């Protein structure tokens with residue numbers, strides 16, 4: 001009862017040798033890839049899928065979503081704002097809607113269902129969601145809602161439990177009722193691991209631990225989480241060197257955000273860090289030696305006016321770099337592949353006479369697959385080879401908008417009227433085919449969710 | 456012979472003199488022109504009513520700067536990360552090589568143009584201005600005739616800008632002289648093209664413009680001949696403008712800035728639109744305004760070649776007309792104008808991190824891609840959804856899963872979505888796209904035919 005994808009025009013593996021293949025196949029057994037190569041046997045195969053005219057990649061992995069923000073897209077007052085106005089805007093709406101019973105757990109479930117379905121249609125097979133800018137998150141069964149939506153759809157899912165534990169009063173940056181006692185956060189997290197965490201290879205739901213950041217959480221939370229990570233082999237995540245962070249840190253602790261993390265147990269290989277826009281250059285070698293990973297988030301970095309993270313420098317230092325979209329209040333889409341084009345182009349003017357420093361299409365596609373898998377600590381994902389999860393995303397190459405394309409991988413980044421995936425498989429299950437959801441009722445999900453968006 | 460009514464569009468963006476937008480409203484079409492825009496329009500003499508519910512309607516997008524033949528030069532590994540010098544050398548070498556091997560004649564260019572122009576319609580683009588500079592040999596071959604043939608077959612509105620490279624490296628230029636034509640040959644050819652193809656009347660479907668490659672690439676004698684020709688025949692003038700090394704090259708050759716050069720040779724006028732305009736001296740900007748020149752913003756190639764951000768806000772502040780374009784697919788590498796708008800919306804912001812009021816808005820960008828481009832091309836009949844203007848219309852569906860939770864649909868069109876494919880597209884009153892598919896063209900056959908002819 002295996003599945004064979006036959007005759008793929010191009011296969012990008014991102015294996016240890018960066019192999020690519022032409023007119024080749026992928027054989028799938030249950031949740032696992034059996035083989036990648038030419039003329040594989042359809043012996044034990046119960047189904048053969050025609051891959052001709054398609055390019056196949058590992059499933060894309062979005063290492064940074066804020067699903068609840070799907071209901072906050074294209075709001076005119078938030079179109080052109082800097083971080084302070086943006087943050088205030090999002091925090092007030094999530095707090096206001098919630099208090100008025102417009103943002104119940106069931107509203108978040110359906111918003112998550114739409115953004116995760118959009119994610120599948122964009123070739124994204126794993127999503128890591130966090131909720132730093134929705135205070136009522138825990139007081140309303142919000143991670144249970146998102147996990148319910150993800151499992152219904154069959155998308156692989158990492159739920160990052162976030163918080164803002166440093167109160168506006170005692171030095172913080174938060175309305176003193178988005179604040180939870182450290183032990184309360186810890187205990188909620190422990191319960192989530194018990195209930196949902198799937199640590200085995202090919203696990204479909206995992207829990208990670210994600211304070212909002214140095215300006216937002218108590219050092220006691222960072223240390224408690226560092227302990228939990230070792231205890232339960234889960235991952236640690238936080239925001240990192242956003243503009244102004246360095247000053248806020250120096251003010252609270254008289255040290256850099258990095259020095260702070262190192263002091264509280266987060267300078268380790270269990271850690272991935274969001275944005276990393278403006279670190280002191282002299283700290284980059286330390287990032288590398290500690291083995292932290294970094295998620296590049298081009299859309300919000302441009303949207304906020306933050307600018308260009310030193311990604312080339314990170315790769316030069318051998319640091320793991322993944323990719324993410326962040327929430328749809330700062331993007332405002334969940335289109336990861338589309339955002340790769342933004343990064344491909346926007347980094348270039350920074351080095352006008354040194355094109356060798358510009359990020360390539362292949363470097364970017366890697367970030368969105370293997371790089372993100374490494375950020376989430378998933379050695380079972382992000383690569384097309386025997387033994388890895390059968391998480392696969394394919395795009396058609398034969399459309400009128402891709403005529404004259406000479407290199408299909410570069411083509412995926414540099415051409416097209418549409419980033420819609422043709423064929424998407426997650427955990428060996430076909431979820432999208434011919435650009436359409438196989439199991440999900442698209443029109444009904446749109447109808448249901450739209451009715452629930454706070455008016 | 457009746458009219459067409461598009462009924463109940465969720466949102467209509469007119470870009471009229473008041474910047475009107477409507478909800479649950481209609482557009483009434485009669486032949487080539489819009490009869491009315493408003494709620495509950497009459498279907499008295501209507502032969503067909505189209506359901507516009509769930510769509511946003513805009514004036515058809517206008518791509519004021521294309522190089523169609525470059526559609527055959529997409530995603531070439533050797534050209535992925537290159538500066539202008541290497542890029543230009545690679546495009547010239549390849550086009551010259553293919554041409555001499557007999558693989559890049561007008562018949563091939565016709566089919567490459569057919570594909571890029573069909574892509575254009577599918578992306579909601581209703582008018583394209585193509586600047587073709589490639590005329591190898593001893594006589595100017597029928598490349599323009601070929602692009603016009605493709606455009607007319609498809610029914611897309613079309614401006615053919617006859618380009619050239621008349622300054623050989625021997626006299627300070629960049630090209631293997633196989634590309635260099637005598638100025639008289641270019642001028643003679645342009646006269647014939649105007650006579651044969653130009654449709655100066657309102658709603659004209661084919662027009663001719665005159666477009667040297669630029670100050671570093673063409674003789675001053677050509678600019679002057681074209682200024683005379685533009686005046687005598689009432690056509691427009693187009694060239695590349697203030698790309699990064701341009702100021703130094705013009706200083707070396709002429710001892711004057713690119714703008715002073717254009718001024719001297721008859722191009723500081725309201726007949727002119729200018730591509731890129733990345734790095735002008737700030738002091739010259741008020742002069743652009745007083746001369747009445749228009750500027751086409753081309754974000755994708757400006758970024759792709761590492762040039763950076765044109766001072767678009769400054770142009771708008773000065774009241775200079777600003778349109779939008781994609782340039783050719785060797786430096787984009789798509790023909791997706793709507794998608795390029797998101798690039799501009801986001802990429803300009805980090806240049807003014809503390810003054811978000813300076814950032815280009817979604818509505819300013821959509822204006823550039825419609826009315827701004829119309830004005831670059833000298834088309835008061837295009838770019839606006841109102842009575843008396845051409846029935847060129849582009850509509851997108853707002854009810855897809857990837858646009859759930861969108862609060863403002865104009866912003867949504869730029870900032871969200873998995874696809875830029877237009878739902879319904881009308882050109883010159885003819886419905887050419889419906890349900891994201893061509894209604895008169897055979898999509899699959901065109902893809903197959905053109906693919907077969909791409910030089911490999």
Ligand SMILES: [Zn+2]
Nearest residue numbers: 064239274326
């Ligand atoms: Zn975030």
Ligand SMILES: [Zn+2]
Nearest residue numbers: 695730782783
């Ligand atoms: Zn050009």
